[PDB]
């Protein structure tokens, strides 16, 4: 009967990197999705499966708010049926996706002048991620036929690389903060409701 922490997720001071993306389980609350749909902050709001208006009339078992940071060119890749470095190696969405994808520019927050090396993305991986999979492996990638045994060098690459966000880059290559809402419904008790 109390309010939902969506404010915790969106207005967070720090956001995780893409490969190590954070997930929040929202439950035992009642939430106003109107704040989200009627806001001018977002640059992208793509719901896949549900009308975000009309949402406050439903109830769900669990609503998951995933969150991370990618470059603006990658925001289109956060979607069912999509392919790219981000969709295959860092964060994948299922084809029968029931949810919404929100993104807004943050060049003023997440871009250091010399390069923000705290944001990473997985560039090497021998198999695409299954939907909703999360890989935090730091093991050196064996590109060659020769084993590396914990030492990087030629054909032995660290599997994560830095976006290196800087503010003078074009709008395309700037950090966008992304939230992904996921709605699930088992034949279990619904606890995430709306007003009235």
């Amino acid at each position, epitope marked *: 009967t109390n309010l939902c922490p969506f404010g915790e997720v969106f207005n967070a001071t720090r956001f995780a990197s893409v490969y190590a993306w954070n997930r929040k389980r929202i439950s035992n609350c009642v939430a106003d999705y109107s704040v989200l749909y009627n806001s001018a902050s977002f640059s992208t709001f793509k719901c896949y499966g549900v009308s975000p208006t009309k949402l406050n009339d439903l109830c769900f078992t669990n609503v998951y708010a995933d969150s991370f940071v990618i470059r603006g*060119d990658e925001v289109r890749q956060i979607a069912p049926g999509q*392919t790219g470095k981000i969709a295959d190696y860092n964060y994948k969405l299922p084809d029968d996706f029931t949810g919404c994808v929100i993104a807004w520019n943050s060049n003023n927050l997440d871009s250091k002048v010399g390069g923000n090396y705290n944001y990473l993305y997985r560039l090497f991986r*021998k*198999s695409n991620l299954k939907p909703f999979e999360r890989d935090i492996s730091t093991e050196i990638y064996q*590109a060659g*036929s020769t084993p590396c045994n914990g030492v990087e060098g030629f054909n032995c690459y660290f599997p994560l690389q830095s976006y290196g966000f800087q503010p003078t880059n*074009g709008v395309g*290559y700037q950090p966008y903060r992304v939230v992904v809402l996921s709605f699930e419904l088992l034949h279990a008790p619904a606890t995430v409701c709306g007003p009235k």
Partner: antibody
Amino acid sequence: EVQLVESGGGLIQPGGSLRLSCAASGITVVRNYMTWVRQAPGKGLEWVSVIYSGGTTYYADSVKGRFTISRDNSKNTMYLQMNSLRAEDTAIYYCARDLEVVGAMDVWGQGTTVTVSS
Amino acid sequence: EIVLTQSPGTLSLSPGERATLSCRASQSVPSSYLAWYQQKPGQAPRLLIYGASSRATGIPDRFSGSGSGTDFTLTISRLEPEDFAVYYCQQYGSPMYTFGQGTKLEIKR
């Protein structure tokens, strides 16, 4: 050493179909970003396609729908099937591996020539 | 689609002089995602600079890269015989890679 060896090309009529080969030594193509890069006679270099380690592929506009890229680890090789071949496809064709921001196209193949002419 | 343009088309200095090869993009491209290749006649491209300024492994200390935004430079501080060839620039910011037109370097005699 570390080498990319190309076979495939030669002389083929328009409307034809070739299959080019990128055989691999001390680099596993199942594990890397692999791209193909052609140079039409006397002109400069043009990007053609890329296969991601997980099998996601990209193709240049002038070739979408006609070129197709494929790999065999057992022979450690990358094939590219070309169809409906036109004059302008006549080029020398390189395959190579890029490392993106870790380095780009560090290993390059010798080149396989393709002429499209009746 | 990003469109790299080089200047000058042709250029001829003598051995030991300085060569300043240019490359400007139709869109600002970050310095991290740009490469310089060298191709001698009949051969195949040789990677020279990965990143705007990083020597690929084996490249002598005389090749250097510089620049940012939409203007980039490749510089040979001293020219030696084996450094006369055609040099290309490539962008890899999108997965749709694109090359420059190329600068032919010849010997002045």
